[PDB]
Amino acid sequence: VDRYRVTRCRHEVEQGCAVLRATPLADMTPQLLLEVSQGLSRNLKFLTDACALASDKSRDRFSREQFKLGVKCMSTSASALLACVREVKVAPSELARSRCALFSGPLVQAVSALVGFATEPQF
Amino acid sequence: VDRYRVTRCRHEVEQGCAVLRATPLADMTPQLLLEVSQGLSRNLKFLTDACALASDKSRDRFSREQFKLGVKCMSTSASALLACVREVKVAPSELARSRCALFSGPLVQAVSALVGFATEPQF
């Protein structure tokens, strides 16, 4: 895989999660919330695409399965977060905004675990 | 839900993940690795059971979906970790042991997000 660009993905997911923690409820407009979701989905797509290719090289059967489980953990984390984001759009509250921070950790960690695996010194 | 016992679950998952980081490769026997997996699966079952019940109370449709997405994030994190654990059993190496620490974060965070949601001041 390409060390530089999987790292840039991970940086962009952390950046987008940071937007959801940094931005007060008053400034969480439909448009700000949409740019963040689109930036997250963009970076998840690339990372899933970057990992499919790496699965294709490795002869090892554990690796191929770990990419599959790593990507699925990433995609289920993403869905839990994107539902909180949608929800703070249609039902603004300090609590729904807190909920976004709460469901960021799982996504940031799922991405960090996938990218750390992908840059083991044999890809 | 029962604040005391969902918190004890979260503590036990953190404890079991800590065993995989604390224990040198030499001491990671089949039996130690098995007790940790069984303790994790025990605590995930309880937490999934504790959350099904909470889903059953809430009239809110977002909550019901968030429990579903929260549990699924937890169960996909668990699978990614348990494959690394199995793998350090059948292919002991410092790298496979590191991989266990790498795939703990997603599980600890998925559990922390689910338990934090479950103890929002309305359950």
Residue numbers in the entry:
A (entry chain A), B (entry chain A): 148 to 270
Excerpt from the paper describing this PDB structure:
Talin rod domain–containing protein 1 (TLNRD1) shares 22% homology with the talin R7R8 rod domains, and is highly conserved throughout vertebrate evolution, although little is known about its function. Here we show that TLNRD1 is an α-helical protein structurally homologous to talin R7R8. Like talin R7R8, TLNRD1 binds F-actin, but because it forms a novel antiparallel dimer, it also bundles F-actin. Increasing TLNRD1 expression enhances filopodia formation and cell migration on 2D substrates, while TLNRD1 down-regulation has the opposite effect. Together, our results suggest that TLNRD1 has retained the diverse interactions of talin R7R8, but has developed distinct functionality as an actin-bundling protein that promotes filopodia assembly.
To determine the extent of the structural similarity between TLNRD1 and talin R7R8, we used x-ray crystallography to solve the structures of both full-length TLNRD1 (TLNRD1-FL) and the four-helix domain (TLNRD1-4H). In both the TLNRD1-FL and TLNRD1-4H structures, the four-helix bundle forms an extensive interaction with a four-helix bundle of a second TLNRD1 molecule. An identical dimer interface was observed in both the TLNRD1-FL and the TLNRD1-4H structures, which crystallized in different space groups. The surface of each four-helix bundle has a pocket created by F270’ and the small side chains of G217’ and A260’ that the F250 aromatic rings docks into. The interface is capped at either end by electrostatic interactions between the side chains of E267 and R246’ and vice versa. TLNRD1-4H bound to RIAM with similar affinity (Kd 0.59 µM), confirming the RIAM interaction is mediated by the four-helix domain. Given the discovery that TLNRD1-4H can bind actin filaments, we tested the ability of TLNRD1-4H to bundle actin, and surprisingly, we found that the four-helix domain alone is an effective actin bundler.
